[PDB]
């Protein structure tokens, strides 16, 4: 999901309701919304053995 | 050595290349067939006849008249379900639930395939 240049529209736009980040027309990249990168994605670097 | 993931396996049977289609046709012969042929299973060909063991129409004997090689199922005459109009359409029954009863000895190229399976002399 990181393959984006998405960004906030800044503030005082109002039309940009929230500092949600959007790419030149549509929102992405945020942990909370559609398709973007996970909150805390599991990786192979995590320990496994006891 | 071939994998055992379900996904890959299903890909072969949904994508069966042409020269391997006999695989989903071979059905069990009868005892009398193997009695003079010394062979258990073999691929179906046209011009043959079969008997059925499963399905609502169990116990039928017909003739090998229709086939679906690419996906692997056949049909036999004298067994149809009438459409709304009244013309018959062929009942589709899989080789998996059939037993062959006789074959065609008029090819000389299907014959040697029979021979090479270590069946005894002739």
């Amino acid at each position: 999901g990181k393959r984006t240049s998405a960004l906030s529209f800044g503030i005082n736009l109002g039309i940009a309701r929230v500092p949600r980040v959007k790419g030149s027309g549509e929102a992405a990249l945020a942990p909370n919304t559609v398709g973007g990168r996970l909150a805390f994605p599991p990786t192979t670097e995590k320990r496994l053995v006891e | 050595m071939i994998s055992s993931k379900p996904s890959k396996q299903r890909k072969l049977v949904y994508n069966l290349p042409n020269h391997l289609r006999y695989k989903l046709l071979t059905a069990r012969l009868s005892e009398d067939l193997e009695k003079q042929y010394g062979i258990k299973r073999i691929s179906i060909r046209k011009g043959d006849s079969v008997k059925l063991m499963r399905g609502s129409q169990v116990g039928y004997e017909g003739k090998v008249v229709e086939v679906d090689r690419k996906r692997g199922r056949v049909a036999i005459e004298g067994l149809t379900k009438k459409k709304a109009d009244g013309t018959p359409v062929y009942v589709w029954v899989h080789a998996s639930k059939v037993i062959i009863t006789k074959l065609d000895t008029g090819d000389k190229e299907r014959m040697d395939a029979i021979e090479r399976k270590r069946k005894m002399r002739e």
Partner: protein
């Protein structure tokens, strides 16, 4: 004017046209160069370390 009429005069030729190499209508005739297919001043193909986000 800065509003719509600024878009008015915009019927003339595209300042970037079909460059023969990369199939992108991005050949700046005016600069004698394509900014997309690289044809014009690099013998090599234009390629960068940042074609995308990494």
């Amino acid at each position: 004017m800065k509003g719509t009429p600024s878009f008015g005069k915009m019927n003339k030729t595209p300042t970037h046209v079909r460059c023969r190499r990369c199939g992108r209508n991005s050949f700046n005739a005016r600069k004698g160069y394509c900014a997309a297919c690289g044809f014009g001043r690099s013998k090599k193909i234009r390629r960068y370390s940042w074609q995308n986000k990494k």
